[PDB]
Amino acid sequence: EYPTVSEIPVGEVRLYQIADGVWSHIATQSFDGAVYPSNGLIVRDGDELLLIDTAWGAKNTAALLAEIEKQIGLPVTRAVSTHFHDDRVGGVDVLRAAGVATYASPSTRRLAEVEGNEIPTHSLEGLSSSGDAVRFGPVELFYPGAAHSTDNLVVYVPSASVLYGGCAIYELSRTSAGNVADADLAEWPTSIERIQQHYPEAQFVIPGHGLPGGLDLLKHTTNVVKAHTN
Numbered sequence: 495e496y497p498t499v500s501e502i503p504v505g506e507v508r509l510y511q512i513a514d515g516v517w518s519h520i521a522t523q524s525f526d527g528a529v530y531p532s533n534g535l536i537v538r539d540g541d542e543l544l545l546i547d548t549a550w551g552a553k554n555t556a557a558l559l560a561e562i563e564k565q566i567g568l569p570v571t572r573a574v575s576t577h578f579h580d581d582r583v584g585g586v587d588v589l590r591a592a593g594v595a596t597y598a599s600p601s602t603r604r605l606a607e608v609e610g611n612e613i614p615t616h617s618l619e620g621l622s623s624s625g626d627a628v629r630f631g632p633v634e635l636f637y638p639g640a641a642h643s644t645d646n647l648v649v650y651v652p653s654a655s656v657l658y659g660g661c662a663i664y665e666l667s668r669t670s671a672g673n674v675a676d677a678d679l680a681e682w683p684t685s686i687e688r689i690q691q692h693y694p695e696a697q698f699v700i701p702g703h704g705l706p707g708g709l710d711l712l713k714h715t716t717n718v719v720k721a722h723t724n
């Protein structure tokens with residue numbers, strides 16, 4: 495039932511209902527000669543929607559907006575990018591053109607600029623230090639410390655017990671650390687431990703790519719990371 499990479503042509507986007515008022519979005523994109531799936535989140539915010547992460551590229555993010563309008567029919571009014579790479583901010587210009595207010599931490603914005611990526615407009619205050627959390631509409635944003643990248647954020651939806659890990663959390667079947675160019679391998683397991691301590695009651699955990707699962711994804715991710723340091 496959760497859609498997989500072979501099922502989603504590049505340029506198409508799927509929505510998957512996780513709970514009342516909470517969806518993931520799934521899209522696909524080419525990276526270094528292969529196509530990969532990628533997850534974001536959508537959360538009902540009263541009469542509006544909160545989007546977590548783009549659908550990895552302008553074309554995909556436009557298909558995401560059209561899919562939302564077709565299937566849900568509420569406006570996306572705000573979007574948060576959880577780190578600075580193109581699967582998370584690629585498409586921000588499309589969001590902004592569509593009337594969406596785009597957000598990221600000051601760190602994410604700076605890194606996106608240096609990288610030549612699209613830059614979310616607004617800075618999120620209060621996420622400077624490992625362990626910092628802030629409320630943002632119907633979610634909590636948490637900076638666990640450096641992991642997949644130095645700036646990566648995770649997102650918790652307390653009304654549904656949904657934890658979105660972005661690229662700091664791997665799916666259960668993934669045994670190989672993927673893109674780790676900007677990762678901090680020594681800090682990653684500590685950052686996971688912070689997530690674990692802060693969200694011990696999470697029921698659904700969404701990795702940045704692939705199948706959702708449970709809190710077992712956190713331990714699994716640490717295992718893969720520790721294995722790729724030995």
Ligand SMILES: CC(=O)SC[C@@H](CCCc1ccccc1)P(=O)(O)O
Nearest residue numbers: 525530579580581661672673702703
């Ligand atoms: C592992 C990630 O989430 S990194 C973001 C890259 C996507 C990498 C996706 C991926 C997933 C599993 C294995 C290899 C690559 P980019 O934005 O630079 O294209």
Ligand SMILES: [Cl-]
Nearest residue numbers: 578579580609
């Ligand atoms: Cl990138």
Ligand SMILES: [Zn+2]
Nearest residue numbers: 577579643661
């Ligand atoms: Zn990344």
